[PDB]
Amino acid sequence: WMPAYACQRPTPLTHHNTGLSEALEILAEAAGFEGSEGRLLTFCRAASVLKALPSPVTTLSQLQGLPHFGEHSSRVVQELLEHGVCEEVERVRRSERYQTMKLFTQIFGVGVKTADRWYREGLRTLDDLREQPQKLTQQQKAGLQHHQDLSTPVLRSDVDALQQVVEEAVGQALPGATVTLTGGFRRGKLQGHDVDFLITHPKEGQEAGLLPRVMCRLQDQGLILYHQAFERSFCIFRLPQPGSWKAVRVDLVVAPVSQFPFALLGWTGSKLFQRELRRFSRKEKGLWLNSHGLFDPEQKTFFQAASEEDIFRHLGLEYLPPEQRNA
DNA sequence: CGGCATACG
DNA sequence: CGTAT
DNA sequence: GCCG
Ligand SMILES: [Mn+2]
Ligand SMILES: [Mn+2]
Ligand SMILES: [Mn+2]
Ligand SMILES: [Mn+2]
Ligand SMILES: [Mn+2]
Ligand SMILES: [Mn+2]
Ligand code: NA
């Protein structure tokens, strides 16, 4: 009834088991803060299974036969169904370790390994980090300075204005080049932490050298608060606001049109969806998938794709629109 | 038990 | 090390 | 933590 891989089932943005999935995702996040990628993955997958169910789970027996539910995830759900709360989840929520690793890793430029080291050094607050700025990278200094704005959700309204701005600079850098909205907003989210754009050009090869030209023009318009040949740019944009402005994270990515379907697929996510899709491709089909292409290692050939639909067909999967990739 | 996605900056 | 989905 |  329920396939094992998230890429084999539709997952809508909103669903019927929100509280249960959020609890399991707390445990997934905490596992990640402790370097347990395997446990993170299982809890993520179990959470996603519930997102894909057609109705609420009300009794423990409804978990029987569901992939990725074993003793641990089942007990989490059991406690939530019986008591409305899971003691393990609540203990994580209020732990100093969890709250601080969450606070630190949310900083642009800070990963788990950096946050862990800072935690072991006794640091606990953002002001603790501001006191010793000589230990910060330029990227972390930017992430810390802009942290408050970057913690404010980006609205769909913000996205349209940013897209117009990016297209203006893209059109000057290379007439005919296109801008596609990707990431969470393409999956139908109404808010997000950042905005993701994919840029290409209909004439293979014309996109070479494009991203530096785009960035130079955005920077000349005074719109870049922070950025690093290249094909991915992780920026902080100055977004106009009523009588002011706010910092917003924007990712710009360039791909040649031959690779565009693969890059669109990868950059549209979700993160779990893409990991599961790549896992499925390799383990079930013997094909190697990334945001550049799909490789047959036996024939030593790349699949040509003209669309996302092509890629799902190549992999023997029913097509899923972006709004059903919210694994 | 081994595996857990796969890149770029 | 960071970043991305 | 769970699957095959
Ligand atoms: Mn009980
Ligand atoms: Mn995004
Ligand atoms: Mn992004
Ligand atoms: Mn490339
Ligand atoms: Mn093992
Ligand atoms: Mn993201
Ligand atoms: Na971070």
Side-chain angles (χ1 to χ4, degrees), chain A residues 2-63 65-70 72-86 88-131 133 136-137 139-163 165-167 169-202 204-218 220 222-227 229-297 299 301-303 305-327:
Chain A
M2 172 75 63
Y5 292 85
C7 57
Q8 290 179 291
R9 56 191 185 243
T11 315
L13 178 56
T14 64
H15 60 90
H16 316 288
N17 288 286
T18 310
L20 299 179
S21 58
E22 287 178 353
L24 293 162
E25 287 181 343
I26 291 292
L27 301 183
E29 185 182 20
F33 294 159
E34 305 311 310
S36 302
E37 278 287 321
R39 300 174 80 251
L40 173 146
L41 271 174
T42 284
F43 284 134
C44 283
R45 293 165 181 163
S48 186
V49 167
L50 300 186
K51 302 179 195 177
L53 288 175
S55 66
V57 173
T58 56
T59 66
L60 198 65
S61 68
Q62 288 163 336
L63 297 178
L66 293 185
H68 308 292
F69 275 91
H72 201 143
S73 304
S74 294
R75 180 259 295 166
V76 173
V77 171
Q78 182 186 8
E79 295 186 7
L80 290 158
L81 290 178
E82 295 176 9
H83 308 293
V85 61
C86 173
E88 183 184 8
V89 174
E90 297 307 303
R91 191 166 56 252
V92 174
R93 285 190 204 273
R94 62 181 175 255
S95 67
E96 175 167 42
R97 168 72 180 186
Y98 173 83
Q99 298 175 197
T100 304
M101 289 292 285
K102 185 166 187 66
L103 179 66
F104 284 176
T105 59
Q106 281 171 356
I107 304 171
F108 178 64
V110 182
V112 172
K113 282 156 187 160
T114 299
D116 176 65
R117 178 171 57 79
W118 289 348
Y119 188 89
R120 292 187 281 99
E121 293 172 4
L123 307 172
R124 295 289 184 277
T125 70
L126 302 184
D127 282 350
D128 295 338
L129 304 174
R130 280 151 180 164
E131 290 165 14
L136 300 173
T137 64
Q139 185 179 55
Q140 292 162 352
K141 290 178 180 172
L144 197 53
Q145 279 162 326
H146 295 291
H147 181 269
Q148 182 174 354
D149 282 357
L150 299 191
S151 84
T152 306
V154 186
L155 311 176
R156 198 18 219 263
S157 93
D158 301 337
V159 174
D160 303 315
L162 282 165
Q163 181 151 2
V165 153
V166 175
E167 291 169 341
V170 167
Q172 293 174 25
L174 180 65
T178 64
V179 177
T180 300
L181 175 65
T182 69
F185 287 106
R186 181 164 181 253
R187 301 197 307 276
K189 294 186 70 179
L190 304 181
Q191 300 178 351
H193 303 116
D194 86 326
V195 190
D196 304 287
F197 293 113
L198 178 57
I199 301 160
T200 190
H201 188 282
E204 187 82 6
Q206 283 299 288
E207 82 297 331
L210 176 55
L211 200 48
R213 291 173 53 77
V214 175
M215 293 307 305
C216 285
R217 282 162 176 78
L218 294 168
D220 288 336
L223 297 164
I224 303 300
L225 294 159
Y226 165 92
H227 71 301
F230 48 102
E231 64 201 41
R232 301 173 185 186
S233 273
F234 320 116
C235 319
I236 301 175
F237 276 46
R238 176 185 176 121
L239 179 63
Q241 290 270 282
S244 187
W245 54 271
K246 66 172 176 174
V248 178
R249 277 275 297 106
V250 181
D251 293 334
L252 303 182
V253 185
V254 172
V257 68
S258 59
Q259 298 176 7
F260 179 83
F262 300 97
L264 182 61
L265 180 61
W267 281 86
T268 294
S270 68
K271 173 179 176 171
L272 182 62
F273 191 94
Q274 294 305 308
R275 299 175 74 160
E276 293 277 287
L277 185 67
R278 295 171 184 194
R279 187 165 69 95
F280 175 90
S281 179
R282 179 176 283 267
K283 303 300 180 179
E284 305 299 323
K285 302 296 173 174
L287 304 176
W288 301 348
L289 177 65
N290 62 24
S291 77
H292 303 307
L294 178 62
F295 183 71
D296 184 336
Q299 297 192 355
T301 61
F302 288 92
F303 290 76
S307 62
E308 295 183 313
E309 285 193 64
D310 262 353
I311 301 169
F312 279 87
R313 285 190 292 258
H314 289 333
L315 297 172
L317 295 166
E318 295 189 23
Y319 177 75
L320 289 174
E323 70 261 19
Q324 301 298 333
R325 305 179 198 160
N326 286 291

